[PDB]
Amino acid sequence: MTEYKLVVVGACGVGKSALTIQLIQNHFVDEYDPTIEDSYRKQVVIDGETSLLDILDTAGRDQYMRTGEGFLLVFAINNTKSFEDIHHYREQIKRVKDSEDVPMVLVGNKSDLPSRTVDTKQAQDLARSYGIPFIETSAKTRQGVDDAFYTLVREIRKHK
Ligand SMILES: *CCC(=O)N1CCN(c2nnc(-c3ccccc3)c3cc(-c4c(O)cccc4F)c(Cl)cc23)CC1
Ligand SMILES: Nc1nc2c(ncn2[C@@H]2O[C@H](COP(=O)(O)OP(=O)(O)O)[C@@H](O)[C@H]2O)c(=O)[nH]1
Ligand SMILES: [Mg+2]
Numbered sequence: 001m002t003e004y005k006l007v008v009v010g011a012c013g014v015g016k017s018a019l020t021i022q023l024i025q026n027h028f029v030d031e032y033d034p035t036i037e038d039s040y041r042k043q044v045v046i047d048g049e050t051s052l053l054d055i056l057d058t059a060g061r062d063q064y065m066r067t068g069e070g071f072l073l074v075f076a077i078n079n080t081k082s083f084e085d086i087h088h089y090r091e092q093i094k095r096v097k098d099s100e101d102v103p104m105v106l107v108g109n110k111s112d113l114p115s116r117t118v119d120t121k122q123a124q125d126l127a128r129s130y131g132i133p134f135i136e137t138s139a140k141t142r143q144g145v146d147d148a149f150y151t152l153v154r155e156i157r158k159h160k
Contacts, residue, residue: 002049004153005067007056009089010074011082015109018139019074020057023149028140035060046150053149065096070103070156072148075118076110077136083108083118086126103155104132107148112138 008016017032024040037059043052056064071093075082086106093102106127108118120136127134133151137144 001052002157003052003054004156005054005056005069006072006149006152007058007065007068007070008072008074009058009093010072010107011076011079011085012060014074014076014079014082015137015139016072016074017057017059019072019107019109019137019145019148020055022139022142022145023055026142028142044150044153046153051153053153055149062096065093068093068097070105070152070159072105072107072152074107074109075123077108077118077123078110078113078115080117083123083126090130101159103152103159104130105148105152105155106130106132106134107137108134109137109139111136111143112140 008020010016012034018029020040021029021032024042038057040055073086073089075086106123108123123134135144135148135151137148
């Protein structure tokens with residue numbers, strides 16, 4: 001039985017809240033208040049081991065981020081600016097965590113949408129350059145949502 005502090009980061013409107021609420025409440029919330037930043041808790045079993053997840057859904061400071069054990073780097077597959085922002089979020093995290101190996105997962109959300117502007121290959125190549133996994137999600141359909149969070153827990157376990 002182990003605890004994990006997870007932090008969900010990424011540009012405004014990529015689906016941080018939608019992803020987190022899907023994980024916790026098992027339904028899709030359209031346009032969750034973009035200014036609400038809160039922590040959520042969920043107990044799960046991953047690879048046989050019971051895990052309590054403490055999840056911070058960041059919104060509109062260093063202290064909270066330093067206590068994070070792993071980070072979901074979320075962009076939206078129809079929003080190139082959010083994908084370009086990922087390297088900046090990565091840099092901010094490394095600086096506050098002291099540029100050490102920090103468990104992270106790259107998450108490409110909104111996979112249900114047709115107007116794609118970032119391809120999986122691009123995201124895989126970015127994830128490869130950081131030595132982290134890439135997971136594609138849709139908070140709307142729930143595809144990949146558990147995978148993103150569970151993969152992060154696995155990355156934290158490998159680090160610990
Ligand atoms: C629409 C409201 C929303 O969802 N917000 C979350 C994203 N917020 C935000 N914007 N910019 C930066 C940033 C990124 C790179 C360089 C400067 C500023 C944000 C950074 C962080 C952050 C910090 O400050 C430290 C460690 C890890 C981080 F992700 C956060 Cl938490 C949020 C940032 C705008 C509001
Ligand atoms: N089509 C689609 N829309 C999404 C998805 N995830 C979030 N959204 C929508 O994208 C917008 C931003 O989502 P939100 O969770 O508020 O993003 P946040 O600012 O990162 O917390 C909202 O209008 C959501 O309903 C998704 O997977 N697919
Ligand atoms: Mg939000």
